[PDB]
Symmetry: C3
Subunit: 106 residues, 3 copies
């Protein structure tokens, strides 16, 4: 998928997590976010379409999605332990990272 | 160890998992798989030897190994929770991903 | 931060972990290590300033931080489960890897 569509997926699953009722729902949403973030790693965002795929700017873009993947895992590890409210709180940090990525690269 | 030797290591530990009984065996084979996948991520596979190191194809190859690493992680998580049968089923699907990447880039 | 400052951050937190009393301290130090490893993926060791950003040597450099990040993941999952002595044992393995990567690229 396109970068913008992956970003839509990330925001939508953040909403799902915010209203989630159990650990399975959180796990499922975070899995979909992980797939969207790994897919966005292969994309080029609008701001960087005038940069080469291995420019320092594009390497930093990909590393920013690595950062997001490890934050997704923090929430996911909490959810795997059945600690649903803790995982939702952790998803708050994901909102910050996603919004900052949106604003930096759109 | 080059890329093809790492793919062989991955397949060997997949067999080890499929015949394992206790969770420490599965976990040990999965940890060896993680190391092999990380070593393969920094290789150039035979199909892409004529491509620029800065090519989109090489970036896609490396992100594909990140995808494999998170699938390995999911299996490893199931094995850490003592869910031997579930981890072995997860590794059965890993056979597909690993051998798909193998045939794709050999 | 540049590469050597990030490696210093890794080493500082490995010492904090060695001399830690509870799991919260281990978790805090490990989260800092993760942030430094990720940030170092965007850095360039002085002796590689001339190579391409996607040169095989720079790929090697970045994937070496992925290797560290998965070791940190193991230690941090152990610390989140209260397995403090086990987390510290894993961090002692981390020390070896950090020093090897330092020797490789400095
Ligand atoms: Ca759209
Ligand atoms: Ca372009
Ligand atoms: Ca290295
Ligand atoms: Cl939409
Ligand atoms: Cl990268
Ligand atoms: Cl990459
Ligand atoms: Cl140089
Ligand atoms: Cl790259
Ligand atoms: Cl890379
Ligand atoms: Co890269
Ligand atoms: Co995990
Ligand atoms: Na030089």
């Amino acid at each position: 998928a396109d970068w913008e569509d992956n970003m839509e997926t990330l925001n939508d699953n953040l909403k799902v997590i915010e209203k989630a009722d159990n650990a399975a729902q959180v796990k499922d949403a975070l899995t979909k976010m992980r797939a969207a973030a790994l897919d966005a790693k292969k994309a080029t965002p609008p701001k960087l379409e005038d940069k080469s795929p291995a420019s320092p700017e594009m390497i930093d873009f990909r590393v920013g999605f690595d950062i997001l993947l490890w934050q997704i895992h923090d929430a996911l590890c909490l959810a795997n332990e059945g600690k649903v409210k803790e995982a939702q709180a952790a998803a708050e940090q994901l909102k910050t990272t996603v919004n900052a990525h949106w604003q930096k690269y759109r």
